[PDB]
């Protein structure tokens, strides 16, 4: 096989959708997956995201069904440290009584960190393991779910829906429309405030729609670039040379050391920006 074929294989997902005859089948080529319309599913993205979320929730429930309230054990000490850190982060930005913000922030942070973490494992281990277990030699299988724009967009669309829901809930529909048509550029004399409603609507609508897009695309770009650089370094090992497979090892080590910090930072940014965006859905900032 060629380097181009090696790279092109790692960039395709395990799709399940409507084949030409029947809504039950996996696409065997990239074009056959593109032919499937909107109603197709990336089975490897969902099967990893759900698995990691379930593992995290089970581990955190193990330290909450038996909270000691006294001297903590090793596990619930870590759980309490995470809960306390999230609570302190929430209280320094949000002053209301909303009971949804803090568990949401904790879930977002830990889930995103777990999803990014599996990028650290070697890029060829899991796809080859899946190919051997299934018995195929051309199986598409991508492990890192956050390199899929569908996952990041699904994460950010629900945050946007929560933002809109809480804005309407706390301000009323009239307040929601007023914070889009009157607040940015405002005056006292009516004759001018009517000439400023379209400018305010344009600006506030652009800023409102740009939040889920930025939240999804920042994470997607960072993770996709990290995994692409990991794939490109693996090509240096494919040449089989000695002096090239030794520089590749050093590059891989340095990239992994940088990528663990990038992975932590991305989850932290997502959590903090979700908290900030939800806190400004509750008061008039202007």
């Amino acid at each position: 096989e060629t380097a181009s074929g090696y790279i092109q294989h790692h960039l395709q997902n395990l799709t399940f959708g409507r084949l030409p005859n029947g809504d039950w089948g996996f696409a065997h080529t990239a074009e056959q997956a593109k032919e499937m319309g909107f109603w197709a599913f990336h089975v490897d993205t969902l099967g990893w995201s759900v698995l990691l979320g379930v593992v995290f929730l089970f581990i955190f429930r193990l330290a909450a069904k038996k909270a000691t309230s006294g001297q903590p054990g090793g596990l619930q000490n870590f759980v309490e440290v995470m809960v306390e850190f999230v609570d302190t982060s929430v209280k320094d930005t949000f002053h209301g009584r909303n009971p949804l913000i803090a568990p949401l922030a904790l879930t977002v942070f830990v889930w995103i960190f777990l999803l990014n973490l599996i990028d650290l494992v070697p890029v060829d281990y899991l796809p080859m393991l899946a190919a051997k277990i299934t018995g195929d030699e051309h199986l598409f299988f991508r492990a890192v779910a956050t390199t899929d724009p569908n996952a990041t967009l699904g994460l950010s669309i629900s945050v946007f829906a929560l933002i809109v829901f809480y804005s309407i809930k706390v301000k009323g529909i009239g307040g929601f429309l007023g914070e889009l048509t009157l607040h940015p550029f405002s005056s006292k004399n009516i004759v001018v405030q009517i000439l400023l409603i379209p400018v305010n609507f344009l600006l506030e609508f652009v800023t409102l729609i740009a939040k889920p897009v930025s939240l999804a695309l920042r994470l997607f770009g960072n993770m996709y670039a990290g995994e692409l650089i990991f794939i490109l370094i693996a090509v240096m090992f494919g040449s089989g040379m000695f002096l090239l497979s030794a520089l590749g090892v050093a590059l891989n080590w340095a990239w992994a050391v940088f990528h663990i910090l990038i992975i932590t930072l991305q989850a932290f940014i997502f959590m903090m920006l979700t908290i900030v965006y939800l806190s400004m859905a509750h008061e008039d900032n202007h």
């Binding site: 096989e1 070697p122 090509v235």
Partner: peptide, 16 residues
């Protein structure tokens, strides 16, 4: 290609 990339990845992963 294969069986050399695996070795390089394993060495780098063990070092990491």
């Amino acid at each position: 290609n294969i069986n050399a990339t695996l070795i390089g990845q394993s060495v780098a992963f063990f070092i990491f």
